[PDB]
Amino acid sequence: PIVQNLQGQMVHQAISPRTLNAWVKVVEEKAFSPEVIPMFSALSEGATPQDLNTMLNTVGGHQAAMQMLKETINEEAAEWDRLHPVHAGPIAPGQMREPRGSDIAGTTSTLQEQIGWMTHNPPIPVGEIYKRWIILGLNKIVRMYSPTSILDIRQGPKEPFRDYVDRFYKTLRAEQASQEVKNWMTETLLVQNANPDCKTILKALGPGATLEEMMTACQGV
Amino acid sequence: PIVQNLQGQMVHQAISPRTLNAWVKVVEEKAFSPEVIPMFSALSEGATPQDLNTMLNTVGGHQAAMQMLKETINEEAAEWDRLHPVHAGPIAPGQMREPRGSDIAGTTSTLQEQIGWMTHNPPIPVGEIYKRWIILGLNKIVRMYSPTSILDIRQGPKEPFRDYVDRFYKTLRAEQASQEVKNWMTETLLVQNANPDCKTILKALGPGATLEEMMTACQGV
Amino acid sequence: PIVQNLQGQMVHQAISPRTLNAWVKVVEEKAFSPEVIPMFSALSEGATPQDLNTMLNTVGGHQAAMQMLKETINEEAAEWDRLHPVHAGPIAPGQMREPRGSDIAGTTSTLQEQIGWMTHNPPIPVGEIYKRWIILGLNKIVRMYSPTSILDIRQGPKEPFRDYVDRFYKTLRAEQASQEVKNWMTETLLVQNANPDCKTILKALGPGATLEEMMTACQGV
Amino acid sequence: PIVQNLQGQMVHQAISPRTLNAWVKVVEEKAFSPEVIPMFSALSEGATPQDLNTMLNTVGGHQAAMQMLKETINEEAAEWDRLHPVHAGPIAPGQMREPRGSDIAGTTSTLQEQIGWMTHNPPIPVGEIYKRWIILGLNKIVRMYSPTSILDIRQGPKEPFRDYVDRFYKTLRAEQASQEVKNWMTETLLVQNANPDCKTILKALGPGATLEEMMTACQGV
Amino acid sequence: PIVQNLQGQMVHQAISPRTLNAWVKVVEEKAFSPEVIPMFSALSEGATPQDLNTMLNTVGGHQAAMQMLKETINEEAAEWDRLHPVHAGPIAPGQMREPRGSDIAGTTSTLQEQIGWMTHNPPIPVGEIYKRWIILGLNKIVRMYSPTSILDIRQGPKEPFRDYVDRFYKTLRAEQASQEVKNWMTETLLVQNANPDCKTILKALGPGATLEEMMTACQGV
Amino acid sequence: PIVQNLQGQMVHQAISPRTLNAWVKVVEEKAFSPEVIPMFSALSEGATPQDLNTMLNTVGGHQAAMQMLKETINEEAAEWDRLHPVHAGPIAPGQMREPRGSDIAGTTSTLQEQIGWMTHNPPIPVGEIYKRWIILGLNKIVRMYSPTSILDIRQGPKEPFRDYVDRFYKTLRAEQASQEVKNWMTETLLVQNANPDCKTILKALGPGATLEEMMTACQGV
Ligand SMILES: CSc1nnc([C@H](Cc2cc(F)cc(F)c2)NC(=O)Cc2c[nH]c3ccc(O)cc23)n1-c1ccc(C(C)(C)C)cc1
Ligand SMILES: CSc1nnc([C@H](Cc2cc(F)cc(F)c2)NC(=O)Cc2c[nH]c3ccc(O)cc23)n1-c1ccc(C(C)(C)C)cc1
Ligand SMILES: CSc1nnc([C@H](Cc2cc(F)cc(F)c2)NC(=O)Cc2c[nH]c3ccc(O)cc23)n1-c1ccc(C(C)(C)C)cc1
Ligand SMILES: CSc1nnc([C@H](Cc2cc(F)cc(F)c2)NC(=O)Cc2c[nH]c3ccc(O)cc23)n1-c1ccc(C(C)(C)C)cc1
Ligand SMILES: CSc1nnc([C@H](Cc2cc(F)cc(F)c2)NC(=O)Cc2c[nH]c3ccc(O)cc23)n1-c1ccc(C(C)(C)C)cc1
Ligand SMILES: CSc1nnc([C@H](Cc2cc(F)cc(F)c2)NC(=O)Cc2c[nH]c3ccc(O)cc23)n1-c1ccc(C(C)(C)C)cc1
Ligand SMILES: [Cl-]
Ligand SMILES: [Cl-]
Ligand SMILES: [Cl-]
Ligand SMILES: [Cl-]
Ligand SMILES: [Cl-]
Ligand SMILES: [Cl-]
Ligand SMILES: [Cl-]
Ligand SMILES: [Cl-]
Ligand SMILES: [Cl-]
Ligand SMILES: [Cl-]
Ligand SMILES: [Cl-]
Ligand SMILES: [Cl-]
Ligand SMILES: [Cl-]
Ligand SMILES: [Cl-]
Ligand SMILES: [Cl-]
Numbered sequence A, B, C, D, E, F: 001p002i003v004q005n006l007q008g009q010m011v012h013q014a015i016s017p018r019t020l021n022a023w024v025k026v027v028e029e030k031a032f033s034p035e036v037i038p039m040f041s042a043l044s045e046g047a048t049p050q051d052l053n054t055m056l057n058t059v060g061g062h063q064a065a066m067q068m069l070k071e072t073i074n075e076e077a078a079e080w081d082r083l084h085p086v087h088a089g090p091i092a093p094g095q096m097r098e099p100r101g102s103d104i105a106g107t108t109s110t111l112q113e114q115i116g117w118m119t120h121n122p123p124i125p126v127g128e129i130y131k132r133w134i135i136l137g138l139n140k141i142v143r144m145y146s147p148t149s150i151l152d153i154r155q156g157p158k159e160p161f162r163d164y165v166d167r168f169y170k171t172l173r174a175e176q177a178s179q180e181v182k183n184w185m186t187e188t189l190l191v192q193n194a195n196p197d198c199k200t201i202l203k204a205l206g207p208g209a210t211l212e213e214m215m216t217a218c219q220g221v
């Protein structure tokens, strides 16, 4: 990775042994849970395309998800090549070539070119672009591996409201929907799918009720 | 995070693999105990909005508390926008735009803007403001998840005074009350709820008795 | 914490994740044994009031001792305010205000003020002053939680002298007494409370006998 | 290893105790699984020939693979000596001798010569060349130790498609074939070896079907 | 501790959390085995009197040995005060006072004075002097806690020579004797106390036989 | 140890707590296996004589091997003193004395002299010389502790060839023989000691057969 600074210039170091270990462990332990994506994002802070490819390569098993992840990278690289068509001509000294999708993914570029792209007067953040493409594929994998729908989340007749809200928002996290759709699920299904004893109490609170007030109201079931 | 210095300028680094691991572990182990908040505060020392969002994202489960935490952030961001109304105009070179609540929470701002806000001649500590908002929501979660009241804390007939004082102050820690209210509980309920054998001894000591003297007096029950 | 240097200027960093973890672990494992105090002192080397408060806040349970610790801090802060009466007047540029007990304890001061006090031409070591006050309270907690007296330490009829000396000096460590009192216990009770077979041998050695010579003499009981 | 920088010059450090430990552990745990190679590549980032030889030497057992690895290094060193024939003459001051295959492998060169080769105005990356030769031998070891063929990977009659795709791409990873051959296996054998119930559904999707769409289609077997 | 450098000046840091932990663990695990002393010496590399006192304070139990260790420190400090008599006079600016035994042990000196003594044009290594005194006391503790003599080490009738030599040199390590005495034990007792079958073979080899040749000769008992 | 650099000057630090721990652990776990020597070499990278002596001192038990190791050091130091006879005369300012074998082993030299020898215009690498002497003694210990000969390594009648080659090269690693002798064992005993079914197949392949081709040929026994 490359760690930035305020006065002077940055440095290029290797992915620390404990970063590699933590990434392998979280995949063995949690596989494709929604919280694995932020763990990957934080373990790959300041990573170059080579550093990001190194992380995905350390995954044993989960090969159907790794292949789906490559197909997503292909789509984002082919979209980049359509928006950014490279120009024919010899590259002048001082300046550097503009990157293609295969250079962002690390396939047709060198580590020196990646470092040179990320470290420039006008910076070319190829490490952040490739990471965005990977996280896109990882969110698809998470949504594909979720075995439930937010529509099936109903409160049990004797289940505490706090346990139902915990299962509600975990299920919503893995839903393939824009924020506006999720707000409609948040403001409609939570009360609509609560048990009859809770549902009546929540419906009396009205439209301005916070989650805190709703949880306080359904304490005695 | 950004680690400050005395002579020169600061540096911007990533959240270390062991900081991420310790935060995930303390949530699995202790969930919403009052001592988890200082652990979060110390693990997020010098954090930017992105670094703070990264920490909350690594939480698996506890989704009702995470949603309550978002609603608290919304309230503090809407209060910030009322106190600090942004001005219409093109931002001049050298200077930078004044932050909105959505920039402090990391939603409508970039990492570069967050670093630029925290590192300035007149500093804009967006990392500390967002952290204050998070700790506010975390204290509400702790108070909401406490299953007891300081009023129900009575000393057992054969329970050593030291064990009753340990249960008294743990229960008080999670109480939703200002310091003045807590001092009234400290100076009234401790002696009032002690067992008859202890209560008489503590009442003889009077008003100037320290906790140390009270604990020394109730040694032989 | 703030790590000092020889040529140049110091830096202000956060309490490392392993320092926080080691402190929580030693409290779960050993609670208020005399050796916990030096562990705290070494884990809080170069700490500011905020860093010291962070450490005490991470303690789960042991709330009677934490309250006793606050009352000790109150006494030392009120003694500081009596010895160091602050003066009324606007603080001049360049110079900084003189600290009160509530600034040393971190309650009515900011991290920037604490850093500014510890880093100055004439230094104001508020971090070391608060740490001294905490260690005072911790020694009171250790003495309060010791369940034995040095007077009750007698050697068993078949107990090896080495085991009796180990129990003697551990018990003396938690005694509330000045060094001069402890030397009188060291030079009087050790031989006086040894078993009759050992006591006679030690009494023949005389007044100039070292602990090494005493331990060598009582090898064969 | 040697960690590069942007402004100034690099430094030469030792292989950290945890890098050595992680490498020994991954060999005891996973032996010659395809994901061990990227772990080696990341643990040997910026390594000199001596640092790379140190890593292979720490392997206990797996001696048939270590001997096969030496024979591969011999072939790559003899190919280097054919492409790069050294010239007879005394080496001038300032300049340095051009490396032979035995200098790249660390046998007939010193650590100072390796550091001098990697750190130069026109750099001679002997550390990266030797690492390429090692990874070549490691890929041969992985292919030699794979106990299955991509041709034998058929879907079970009651086996979920996701489990069959996981076993398909793991088996393909260890296949000794160029990327073009692997694409023919990817576009031909996956559907051809699926169970009759899945095979019919996949064949209806056609030629433009992604892995994501194929996995979505075979959800209900 | 204080870590030295070549170009510039040194820095003063705290005893790392893992150094404190490793020291506590080796005492719980091995107590006063001869190999604990080098572990202490390496964990206290570059330590000041305060850092050395911090390490001994973290020892739980072993209080008879800790008291014996204080008495040894007293003897070395009183010997220092006899060899180095301090002079009466006000200390001039720039220069610093010459240390007493109580300043070397950290009792009547401050951390700043210890740093100032170790960092000077003519250096006063108080950290190394106190460490020498501690290691002296630790070697006495090791010799006092050894439960065997080199004279009692005889080879078993069916015991392999290698096992007898291992028990011989471990027992010699804890012997209270100068190097010349130990060489006489090495050149006399090893062969003299070997079993009759080995003793005859070793006696035929003569006076110039190495340990390697002796071990090779007694392979078949 | 002393970590070298490119622009400027090196630094002298202590052996890290985890380096000391890893060295003690590998000796408890593997004792004198051939792979322990490279672990020692990598854990002692950039070590001074004092740092190397510190490592050997941390070994509990294995005292016959530690004594054999001292006798080897004695031989290499007496050979150094024969090749490098020191000259009588007062050492001039600026220059430093030429080292004897007892200075290289750390017995008659100080840490400052060792640092001064390794850091010089014409460098005197006493740390590397002593390390070479130690590794010589360690290889003798490994050869002395090997309980088998390469001549006794025969393939089982039902044992897979891969398992026989693994046992062949592990046994050869601990053989006391020059590289030319080992090549004769590699090119003669491997095929000569294979089982009759394998031996015939390997003999048909001829003289140019690689280990990879030999292992591929004996797959079906
Ligand atoms: C020098 S560029 C680089 N270096 N390494 C990698 C990727 C890293 C990787 C990516 C991924 F999406 C999932 C992974 F599991 C691994 N490794 C791999 O393909 C190795 C691999 C993992 N399983 C397999 C199953 C079958 C197989 O035959 C190979 C593999 N790339 C890289 C290669 C191709 C691409 C495109 C997607 C653009 C075609 C991108 C990067
Ligand atoms: C680029 S800004 C950013 N990046 N990440 C985050 C927060 C981080 C987070 C915050 C929190 F209070 C609790 C969390 F668990 C996580 N992540 C999330 O929402 C992800 C998430 C966690 N569970 C869920 C259940 C349902 C769901 O659909 C999503 C989630 N934000 C962020 C987003 C919104 C907000 C407002 C509160 C202002 C609306 C603030 C920050
Ligand atoms: C921004 S200053 C600061 N920040 N944090 C702290 C202390 C840190 C702390 C101190 C202590 F002696 C024992 C502790 F366990 C914790 N935290 C606390 O009180 C939190 C706490 C721990 N259990 C409780 C049980 C009941 C309760 O209602 C609260 C708590 N202070 C701080 C507060 C007051 C004081 C005085 C003693 C001067 C009144 C000093 C510091
Ligand atoms: C100062 S150069 C250096 N330093 N160390 C090494 C290699 C490192 C190593 C390489 C490898 F491919 C596999 C290994 F297991 C180890 N160590 C070794 O041979 C030691 C070793 C491991 N098992 C053995 C079984 C039998 C035996 O008699 C010895 C060994 N070389 C090195 C030596 C030779 C070569 C050529 C391949 C060019 C002939 C290259 C490097
Ligand atoms: C600011 S100087 C300093 N700071 N801490 C220490 C020593 C550190 C220590 C030394 C030792 F030899 C053995 C130890 F276990 C601890 N701590 C202690 O005495 C605490 C201690 C450990 N068990 C005890 C049993 C009884 C008791 O009443 C106290 C204790 N000194 C220090 C004190 C005295 C001396 C002389 C030997 C010169 C009199 C030297 C240093
Ligand atoms: C300030 S020089 C230094 N500092 N420490 C050491 C060695 C380090 C050591 C070396 C070794 F080969 C094996 C070891 F186990 C330890 N320690 C030791 O002898 C301690 C030791 C380990 N077991 C023993 C059994 C009996 C005994 O009476 C002592 C010991 N030397 C050192 C001493 C002598 C020599 C010569 C070989 C030249 C005579 C070299 C260094
Ligand atoms: Cl690791
Ligand atoms: Cl509930
Ligand atoms: Cl979407
Ligand atoms: Cl609730
Ligand atoms: Cl970790
Ligand atoms: Cl009590
Ligand atoms: Cl409040
Ligand atoms: Cl009590
Ligand atoms: Cl940790
Ligand atoms: Cl005894
Ligand atoms: Cl006292
Ligand atoms: Cl004893
Ligand atoms: Cl390690
Ligand atoms: Cl499936
Ligand atoms: Cl190929």
Ligand SMILES: [Cl-]
Pocket: A144, A145, D162, D215, D216, D219
């Ligand atoms: Cl699926």
Ligand SMILES: [Cl-]
Pocket: C018, C022, E017, E018, E021
């Ligand atoms: Cl630790």
Ligand SMILES: [Cl-]
Pocket: E160, E161, E162, E163, E218, E219
């Ligand atoms: Cl033997």
Ligand SMILES: [Cl-]
Pocket: E176, E177, E178
């Ligand atoms: Cl002696």
Ligand SMILES: [Cl-]
Pocket: E162, E215, E216, E219, F144, F145
């Ligand atoms: Cl032997």
Ligand SMILES: [Cl-]
Pocket: E018, E022, F017, F018, F021
């Ligand atoms: Cl450690």
Ligand SMILES: [Cl-]
Pocket: F160, F161, F162, F163, F218, F219
């Ligand atoms: Cl085989």
Ligand SMILES: [Cl-]
Pocket: F176, F177, F178
């Ligand atoms: Cl040889």
Ligand SMILES: [Cl-]
Pocket: D144, D145, F162, F215, F216, F219
């Ligand atoms: Cl094979």
